[PDB]
Amino acid sequence: RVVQPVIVEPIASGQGKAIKAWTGYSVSKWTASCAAAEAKVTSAITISLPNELSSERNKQLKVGRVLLWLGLLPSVSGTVKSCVTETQTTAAASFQVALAVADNSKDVVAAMYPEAFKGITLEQLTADLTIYLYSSAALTEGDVIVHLEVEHVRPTFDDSFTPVY
Amino acid sequence: RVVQPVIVEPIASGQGKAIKAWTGYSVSKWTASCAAAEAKVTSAITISLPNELSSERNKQLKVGRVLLWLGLLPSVSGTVKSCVTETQTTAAASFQVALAVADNSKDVVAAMYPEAFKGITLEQLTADLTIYLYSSAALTEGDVIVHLEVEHVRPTFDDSFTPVY
Amino acid sequence: RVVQPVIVEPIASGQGKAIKAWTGYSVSKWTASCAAAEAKVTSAITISLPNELSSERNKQLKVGRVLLWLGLLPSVSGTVKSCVTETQTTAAASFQVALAVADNSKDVVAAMYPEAFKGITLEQLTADLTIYLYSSAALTEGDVIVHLEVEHVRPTFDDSFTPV
Amino acid sequence: RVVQPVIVEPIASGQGKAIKAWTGYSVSKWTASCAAAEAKVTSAITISLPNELSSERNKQLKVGRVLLWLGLLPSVSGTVKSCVTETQTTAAASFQVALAVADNSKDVVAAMYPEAFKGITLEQLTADLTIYLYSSAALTEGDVIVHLEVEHVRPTFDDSFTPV
Amino acid sequence: GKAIKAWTGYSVSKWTASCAAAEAKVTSAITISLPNELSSERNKQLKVGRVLLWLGLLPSVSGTVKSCVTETQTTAAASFQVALAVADNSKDVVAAMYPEAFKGITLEQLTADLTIYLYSSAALTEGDVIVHLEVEHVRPTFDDSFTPVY
Amino acid sequence: RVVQPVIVEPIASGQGKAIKAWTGYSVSKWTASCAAAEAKVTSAITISLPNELSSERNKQLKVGRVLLWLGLLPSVSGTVKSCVTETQTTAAASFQVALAVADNSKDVVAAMYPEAFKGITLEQLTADLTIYLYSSAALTEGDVIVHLEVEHVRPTFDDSFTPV
Amino acid sequence: GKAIKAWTGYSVSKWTASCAAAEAKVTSAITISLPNELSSERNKQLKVGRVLLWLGLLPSVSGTVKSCVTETQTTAAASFQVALAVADNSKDVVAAMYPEAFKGITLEQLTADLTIYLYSSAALTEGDVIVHLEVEHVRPTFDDSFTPVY
């Protein structure tokens, strides 16, 4: 083949292509504020459904892909790592078996799970999975906000009013 | 015309036909718990958006039809009336100008507003409208739960993940 | 005809079908606040045009149908009745000649006058008709708001600015 | 449309049309006997699967629609209300969030839940939902029988004998 | 000699405000309040077209009288420096026409964001000046039918 | 597919492709000069409309996409970060919820907000959003110029002279 | 009653200048400064069409106030003798429209070659008069896109 000249166009933060939800799915996005932690400790963060997903009908919605990313205070230093895995007996061990890890030392600070949790219900997601957060430096409560974006079947129960009788 | 014989089939509570949201709309349903009130007092209840609708994008979604109904403790006695109207200077006066009133002395305890608030944004709904609740008997806090069902344009911002960059 | 089973679907307050104005007509809606009155007294309420209809031109517009309904404070008890009639010498006698009465003891507290006043002008409506309000219990001022909805030929005076 | 005269034919108790289960579904019907309760108390009644649905396999069957109705002793007086809701911290609060209430003051003492619980399994029905029963007068045990009819995917575990 | 016709699908609502008492050379703020027929939540969303302000003075009112419609000001007298038109009784045509300034805002926004300002070189007794406001706006649809009786 | 050799052609500062406004939109560009701040402090910078957009009519124009980038004095050292978010109770928390951050440690010191603020008016942009600026080292006033480029519906109020 | 529409491919930029303090009967020079959105080298080359000057006075300003746009003068008061239009508060229409005088010059040339002149028979306090300048010019193309991020 003949050499092809290319020009790599720089893009700004936020310009990345957004991953579109599957047909019939929507992406629910919510946050967890980290707890205070000593240096080099890995903390478990429970996954709790937002109120709009906690109803009897909505708890059963099947999960698709899952995205995890971190919101750090601008002054946070050191290494911050986070992942979603099946609940561990030892919190630190989560990073040894996670299929993706959000690590602030990387160019892209985000962990995508396109297959690992597909097909479970939202309730199962809360019961079986845990978020793990590691910091090389001690964390004050709220230093890190964990953003969890969970793709799931679109709820249908709210496509109509409650019958008036 | 020749007389037509008909049989009126009784239906149970809950069997009423559900009003389907308009194409491109969904129905958000949330509750307000009444405050304590003396007998025959009309109380104003602020309309506050649920967390899932409070974002910058979602606050702008246009309203369609609005439904109001009441959840009373089984032991609540006397007359209970509620309505949604433009915010009043005198709370009791709301019932004099409301286009619909949910009244527990009626066979159907519900107030539907198919036209009165169509086209405003959710933020406008919270800023301009108020729920009014009247009881002939004194109310303890939580005696009445006001159910507000607000049809509005389906949010689109959650049809994709946040770009990872 | 064979028997036809039916289900009567419940409907809520506010779900009733709106009556559409005739082509070339519009519905002007305004309110009158009741005066204080003793128990079982019938009070006369003057019909006054809202500002936008009180001009020389607009008060010539012809009336179609007229709707009356009542807004009660939630604490109002007893029987409240209202009607629109030609002005009476004895206020209570209005109810003996009214063709429709708004009565709070009914499921629909409203009175429709589809023919009685058809063809008169808004000025004639204000000059020849009166609203009558009866309460079994004493009324405090503003206890009852009378809603009058008058269908009339759509104004054309409002289709232009005042010349300057 | 020209006026259509109709005759409303009286129908007796028991003549109402039965709601047919969806294709591939069946309706399982069982009862719960109310516990003694003081006047104006709301009691929680656990939803327990009948023996034939309590196996590991059958408790996975998906729910469709749910019907609640009440069987009262003929001497029971006062107001009796019942509903099915997600389990409540305060029993009386169930009626504030129920989408349907069976109420003996109505002509039809029954509550239908056509959507609220659709898709959950029978095990989830037993684990997440509760029956709530309110009486204005004191209840003696067994005064009220709560009839629960749960539509669910037709069992296939019952299509064969236990292997031997 | 010829009235300015409203745009197709629009109509002109005309109402008045009676001036408050004011000392000489004071600029007074006058709130814009919708008439009753426009005060429903639905009618409050009707889009504005053109706006006309003109003044009705008692024939004995002397001195200079000026008025304008502008976005609400921190200093009332400063309205006349930014107003896109001023009704001024010393001119041949005592009126302020705003064909563009407010096009597209809702009646609610008109009432919330704009203020009428009125200046008089001499003291004003209450009701000496009637401010006339004519607001062209989308024709209401909510009042093309009676209120549902149920 | 057979291996495809490529040559990555170097490009200079300023050679990047410009993002074209949507049809019927235009990009308004203005600056805010940073305030003095201590090391590691996050400062809130109010978003104020330029004079030509501050009229009653123009502040109703709907927003499209928003671009943020930073102009640093050549001597500015340390880490400087900035973002646009909904107004925060704690300024430093903006970076935990921002969908994009302009960061001088990157090759491209800019943040694009293609969806977050789509559909709001310019007035709502000024009233609900805030610019947040963080520096690891102390900032002297004017050390950093924040460039905000807001895509919005093309004004039509500017298509005519003021009537006279 | 009807606004003058800009030519196809043109738009009207409108900005203001706050008058300086001035003694009675002095003519003051006011520099024409482009707004920020027009100050880029590219936007400075946009061709001018028509120009409008009008005045916003505090309602209590008395006496005669005049203003014009002309090529910069050695004697400020002499501007009014050669101005092709003068905004004069004693007239019915207080504005100066220049449909031809500056057609085709660039915005840069407008700022460099022309001056606003303001005369008042009485002393002016700073900000008593706001001069409004509306310059029709070719629509900018440079701001139809975001700045390249690299």
Residue numbers in the entry:
A (entry chain I), B (entry chain I): 26 to 190
C (entry chain C), D (entry chain C), F (entry chain C): 26 to 189
E (entry chain D), G (entry chain D): 41 to 190
The authors write:
Once the calcium ions are no longer present to compensate these negative charges, electrostatic repulsion causes the capsid to expand. In the absence of divalent ions, the virus can also be artificially contracted by lowering the pH below 5, which protonates the negatively charged residues and thus removes their repulsion. In contrast, a sample prepared at pH 5.0 yields the structure of the fully contracted state with a diameter of 28 nm. The resolution of 1.6 Å is considerably higher than that of the extended state, which is more flexible and prone to partial disassembly. We then dock atomic models of the extended configuration into slices 1–12 (extended and partially contracted particles) and of the contracted configuration into slices 25–30 (fully contracted particles), from which we determine the motions of the capsid proteins. The contraction of CCMV is accompanied by a simultaneous anticlockwise rotation of the pentamers and hexamers, which are both rotated by about 5 degrees in the fully contracted state. It reveals that the pentamers rotate about twice as fast as the hexamers, adopting a rotation angle of over 3 degrees in slice 12, while the hexamers reach only about 1.5 degrees. This rotation of the capsomeres is accompanied by a superimposed rotation of the capsid subunits around the axes indicated with black arrows in Fig. 4a. However, whereas subunit A has already reached its final rotation angle of ~7 degrees in slice 12, subunits B and C have completed only about half their rotations of ~11 and ~13 degrees, respectively. The process thus resembles a collapse that is triggered when the electrostatic repulsion is removed that keeps the capsid inflated.
Cowpea chlorotic mottle virus is an icosahedrally symmetric plant virus in the Bromoviridae family that infects cowpea plants (Vigna unguiculata). The 180 identical capsid proteins are arranged in 12 pentamers and 20 hexamers. The asymmetric unit (highlighted) contains three subunits A, B, and C (magenta, green, and blue, respectively). CCMV is thought to achieve this by detecting a change in its chemical environment upon entering the host cell, which causes its capsid to swell, increasing in diameter by about 10%2.
